[PDB]
Amino acid sequence: PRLVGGDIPCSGRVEVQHGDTWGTVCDSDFSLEAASVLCRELQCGTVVSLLGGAHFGEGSGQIWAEEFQCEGHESHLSLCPVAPRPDGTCSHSRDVGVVCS
């Protein structure tokens, strides 16, 4: 994963790679536990905050169609169980962001 658009490396819009392309994550779909896994995986410590409403700017391109249903203690987002997001797609106006400690 990566965080993009922050003034420091450990804050920004969440983007996660699938194959050759990157996808953003809808703020209806991303829990504090998934954020905690992301912050750990990036060596940023722990989630302080989720930020909604394209706080760091909206992304472009794909938006993840599955939710990362993390328990919390996974070392990588890739080890979290996955599930479909609710009925429909989101706009990039809803891309989620994080501030890690």
Residue 73 CB neighbour total at 10 angstroms: 10
Non-local (6+) Cβ contacts of 24 within 8 A are 13, 14, 15, 58, 59, 61, 62, 63, 64, 92, 95, 96
Residue 90 one-letter amino acid: C
Range list of H helices, 1-101:
32-41
Cβ atoms of 71 and 80 closer than 8 Å = yes
Cα–Cα–Cα angle for 20, 22, 24, rounded to 5 degrees: 160
For this entry, resolution in Å reads 1.8
Structure tokens at 26: 């809808």
Burial 1-33 (b: 16+ CB within 10 A, else e): bebbbbeeebbbbbbbeeeeebbbbbbebbbeb
Burial 75-95 (b: 16+ CB within 10 A, else e): eebeebeeeebeeeebebebb
d(CA 34, CA 84): 15
- Structure-determination technique: X-ray
The total domain count for the chain is 1
- Beta strand segments in 1-101, E: 2-5, 11-18, 21-24, 47-51, 62-63, 66-68, 82-84, 97-100
Q: CATH no. for residue 65? A: 3.10.250.10
For 6, list phi and psi in degrees, rounded to 5: -80, 165
For residue 84, the enclosing domain spans 1-101
